[PDB]
Amino acid sequence: SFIKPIYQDINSILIGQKVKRAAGEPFEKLVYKFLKENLSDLTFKQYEYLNDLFMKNPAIIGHEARYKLFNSPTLLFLLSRGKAATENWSIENLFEEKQNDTADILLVKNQFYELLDVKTRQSPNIISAYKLAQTCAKMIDNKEFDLFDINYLEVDWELNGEDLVCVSTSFAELFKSEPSELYINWAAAMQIQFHVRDLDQGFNGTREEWAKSYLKHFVTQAEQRAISMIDKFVKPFKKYIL
Amino acid sequence: SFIKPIYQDINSILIGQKVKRAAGEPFEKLVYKFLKENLSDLTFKQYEYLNDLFMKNPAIIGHEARYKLFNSPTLLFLLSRGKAATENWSIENLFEEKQNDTADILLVKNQFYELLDVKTRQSPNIISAYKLAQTCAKMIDNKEFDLFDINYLEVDWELNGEDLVCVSTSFAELFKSEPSELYINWAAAMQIQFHVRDLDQGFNGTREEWAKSYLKHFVTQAEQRAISMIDKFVKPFKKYIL
Incomplete structure (x- = not known):
């Protein structure tokens, strides 16, 4: 993680912040620059x-050719917009902030990525279990266990009027x-x-073991849920319809 | 239905209403009195x-005895609070408006009930398919097909500032x-x-046929959903966990 080594800073720097009145929490914008600067x-x-x-590969046109610019099936899966949108991007028709984007903030450095999300506070939705399963299957299929990490930065607030x-x-x-x-x-x-504060951090196995373990947990749960239905x-x- | 015979009134009376700033829509409170008066x-x-x-049966104490005051397994299922809450009710400790109550408004007359809900505007949640299934199973089990109806009153609005x-x-x-x-x-x-405006109204079979038909539709859907999972x-x- 990148934001961690300096997490101490951000934490103390924000623990006593400010802001006026789903909905929205500007607290996120506060970390973008905290990390932007x-x-x-x-x-x-x-x-x-x-x-x-x-923009760095303007000679590259069409969705197929641009998709390769990711050099990673998983990263492509995690970060890319669909085919039409990718096909239609055109230097003067740039992508705009989207709601369903995997990561609220992305930290890249030396081919390594950190999908960082920011939550603010019934535990909030963090990630579709199916997309997490598809992500683990791609890591394993392509043997990519050191490409990215999905981290989270949480911040709590108290209503002091408006x-x-x-x-x-x-x-x-x-x-x-x-x-x-x-x-x-x-x-x-x-x-x-799950609340980030309550999230667990005891895993000790390899990343690949984390992918199989998550898959085992996902399949088992899905399976019992279906039998449960x-x-x-x-x-x-x-007896009512036969 | 009761509110229907006069629906014409309410409609025109509200179609040009007013109100200041989930969330909430006071429009509901407007029908309670519209029907209260x-x-x-x-x-x-x-x-x-x-x-x-x-209150009409103060000599009746305990949840079991009070539950019978409903004289209807289905109505009990549809309207009653749980056992503890029912047991704890005490003339001077009355029930208060609750969020999960089946009907936003209830119209009763001569042993007949009209669970009336009011929606205001992604179609909104109207009723748990499982609770609807449990409701149909109770009707059929107890042969109660002329006890109640679940109707809806919708109202649309436009944001004119605050x-x-x-x-x-x-x-x-x-x-x-x-x-x-x-x-x-x-x-x-x-x-x-489903939006009330788009809801269908073509059914023509008996109420009991509506209960079986809904059940058939529910079971089939649940069944294919589970196989789908x-x-x-x-x-x-x-192949990833074996």
Whole structure:
């Protein structure tokens, strides 16, 4: 992680911040520059990183050719916009900040990436368990276990009228938590939920072992959920429709 | 339906309403009285109806005995608070408006009930497909097909600054729509979603046929969803964990 070595700073620097009145939390914008100024050259908005990548290869046109510029099936999966959007990008028609972008902030340095998200506070949705499964399958399929990390920076606030004051922080690393500990809210569109402060950080196996372990946990959960749907929503009601 | 015979009124009376700044829509409070004044004796807030029912039988204590006051397994299922809460109610410790109450407004008259909800405007959540299934199973199990109806009153608005102006209305009746037409958003916690204006009203079979038909539609959907979970989330990932 990059933001970690200096996390101490950001933490104390924000723990006593300010701001006026889903919804939104400007606290995120506070880390972009906190890392924009202090961490120039590394910090990037995902869409910003995408424009930068295509701008550096202007002779490269069409989605297929631009997709290769990622030099990584997983990274492509994690960061790329769809085909049409990629095809339509044109130097003077740049990508704009998007809502569904994998990472709120992207830190790149020497071929290594850090998908950093920022949460602010019913645990919030962090990542689709299925997209996390597809991500692990790509890592394993392409043997890419040192390409990126998905980290999180949390910040708490207190309502002081028409204002919002920061109270503390939390920094966690998805790939440092035991996969089986990840809670999946199936009803909530299969979204994994957890407060960063409560996230676990005890994992000790290799990255690849984290991918298999998460997959094992995902498959098992999906499997029992489906059998559970049959037992609760199907079998008890047959006597009414047969 | 009760509110229908006069729906014409409410519609025109509200289609040009007013209001200042989830969230909330006071438009609902506008129908309670619209029906409170004009429809006195019938109109009820669910919790209000519950207090009224227990107050009329003060000699009746304990959850078991109070539960019988409903004289209807389905109605009990649809309207009652849990056992502890029912046990703890005490004439001077009345129920208060609750968020999860089945109906936003309840219209009662001569043993007949009208669970009326009010929506205001991604289709909004209307009713858990599972609770709707449990409701149909109770109707059939107890042969209660003329006890209640679940209707809806919709109202549209336009943002005129720090204000909200009503534009039109929509009135629909759940049991008048073909069951198979009901859309179930499994990812969205199995909630059924649909705008009242777009709701269907072509059903023509008996109420009981509506209960079986909904059940058939529910079971089939649940069943294919579970098989779908296996095919997408289980089988494609086995090769990674075996």
